[PDB]
Amino acid sequence: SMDFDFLKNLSLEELQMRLKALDPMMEREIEELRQRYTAKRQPILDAMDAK
Amino acid sequence: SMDFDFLKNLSLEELQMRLKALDPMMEREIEELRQRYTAKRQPILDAMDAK
Numbered sequence: 001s002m003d004f005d006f007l008k009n010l011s012l013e014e015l016q017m018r019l020k021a022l023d024p025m026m027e028r029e030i031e032e033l034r035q036r037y038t039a040k041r042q043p044i045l046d047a048m049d050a051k
Numbered sequence: 052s053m054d055f056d057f058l059k060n061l062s063l064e065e066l067q068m069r070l071k072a073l074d075p076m077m078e079r080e081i082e083e084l085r086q087r088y089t090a091k092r093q094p095i096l097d098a099m100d101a102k
Contacts (some may be wrong), residue, residue: 003094005098008101022092030084
């Protein structure tokens with residue numbers, strides 16, 4: 001793949017660092033997702049309150 | 052919003068159903084994040100293997 005073609009040009013140490021960064025990056029994305037879902041919830045709550 | 056104007060129409064029962072559905076929806080999106088980040092590990096590992 002293109003990603004492999006790019007990554008093969010990096011040092012081993014850089015590749016090790018990139019591998020280790022994935023889990024914390026994913027965890028931050030999950031936190032972002034939770035914040036986006038508060039904004040999905042709110043209009044529904046607002047509509048309930050307007051009935 | 053046109054979305055809010057839609058939601059205001061809905062019965063309380065319909066709003067409750069939508070609010071409750073957001074939980075499995077968010078969890079499904081967390082599962083997709085897991086898949087996306089595992090995609091990402093593979094080419095890194097492949098580039099490491101190739102040294």
